[PDB]
């Protein structure tokens, strides 16, 4: 049958509601329904280095990795996930997790990247204050230097222009 098949065959006795209830009773005993991680395909989000064997892993390399939902949530609301790969040379497990507040990632185990909810709420309020809000003689001495530099540039350029005429 094709990929986009519309109908699947149900036996004539099939009650969907009883079937779901029976399958729910069954699901608590199946191995692969209760294992702690989901296998996924993902790209390496940043350049990283394995700590066991010093192998460099570039960004955008594809891996077969394990996804874990963590117990902790960002501001008790948003899901955080650990993402675990294994080093291509030495097969050692490298792990990193999402960082929703930064909209970024942070390293956990096996590797190194190349280059508190109350406190977070307070920091966010202060950040919003900076967002909405967005030495005197030293600045004046810098304005003096800037005005001198501006007016001298024309004489420098005119010296170059005359030099070009002399060279010609």
């Amino acid at each position: 049958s094709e990929r986009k098949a519309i109908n699947k065959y149900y036996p004539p006795d099939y009650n969907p509601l009883e079937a779901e209830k029976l399958s729910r009773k069954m699901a608590k005993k199946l191995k692969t329904m209760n294992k702690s991680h989901a296998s996924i395909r993902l790209m390496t989000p940043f350049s990283m280095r394995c700590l066991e064997c010093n192998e460099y892993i570039p960004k955008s390399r594809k891996f077969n990795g394990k996804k874990e939902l963590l117990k902790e949530k960002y501001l008790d609301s948003i899901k955080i996930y650990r993402l675990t790969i294994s080093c291509p040379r030495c097969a050692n497990s490298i792990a990193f997790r999402t960082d929703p507040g930064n909209s970024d990632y942070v390293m956990e185990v096996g590797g190194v990247r190349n280059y508190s909810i109350d406190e977070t709420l307070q920091r966010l309020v202060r950040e919003k204050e900076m967002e909405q809000n967005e030495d005197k003689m030293d600045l004046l001495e810098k304005r003096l230097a800037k005005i001198q530099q501006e007016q001298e540039d024309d004489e420098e350029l005119e010296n170059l222009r005359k030099k070009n005429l002399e060279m010609s």
């Binding site: 460099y56 291509p88 040379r89 190349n114 060279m167």
Partner: protein
């Protein structure tokens, strides 16, 4: 944007591997440089064919004449002088008056000869021999324990697959010539069976 000495050495070592038509590979090493800049750096400073040596008196005469015959056309003048252009412009003007980590990645990449899937293939071969030696050693332990397990033959990938120990697989006997081979045939049979008994008892 200044070029460091380490970046120049990385570029030369990279061009030794990749040639002068794969600058995106060169720039994948030089972390702060683009391919465009790397091609510029090679073609105008680091290519060994470039002649940066001091001008002869004849060259100064030639350069001044060409600068009159082809005014401001410095890439053309340079191609005729067989020298870099910025050299010709400077000469014409004279006559008329943490980085260790990048190098580590560079050496690691450039001295890697294998590529990805060949590396995975030698890893696979290592794992296969590990499993084979596992079976062999386990069989030896069980043989010392006095329970003589037989070695498992490999599984046939397809129904007509061959075990090369059961038969001489496509036997092409030598065509019989004029000379009688019988005596040395029975001698060879003696040799082979002697070797078989020897490997049975001595290993």
């Amino acid at each position: 944007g200044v070029w460091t000495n380490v970046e120049d050495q990385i570029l030369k070592a990279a061009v030794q591997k990749y040639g002068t038509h794969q600058w995106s590979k060169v720039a994948s090493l030089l972390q702060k440089k683009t391919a465009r800049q790397s091609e510029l750096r090679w073609n105008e400073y680091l290519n060994p064919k470039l002649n940066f040596t001091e001008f002869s008196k004849e060259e100064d005469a030639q350069l001044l004449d060409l600068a009159r015959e082809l005014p401001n056309q410095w890439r053309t003048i340079a191609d005729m002088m067989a020298r870099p252009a910025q050299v010709c412009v400077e000469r014409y003007n004279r006559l008329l008056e943490e980085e260790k980590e990048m190098l580590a990645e560079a050496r690691a990449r450039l001295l890697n000869t294998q590529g990805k899937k060949a590396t995975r293939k030698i890893r696979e071969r290592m794992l296969e021999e590990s499993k084979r030696i596992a079976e062999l050693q386990k069989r030896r332990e069980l043989k010392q324990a006095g329970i003589n397990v037989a070695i498992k033959k490999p599984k046939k990938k397809y129904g007509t697959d061959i075990d090369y120990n059961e038969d001489i697989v496509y036997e092409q006997a030598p065509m019989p010539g004029i000379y009688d081979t019988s005596t040395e045939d029975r001698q060879i049979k003696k040799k082979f069976e002697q070797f078989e008994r020897k490997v049975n008892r001595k290993g």
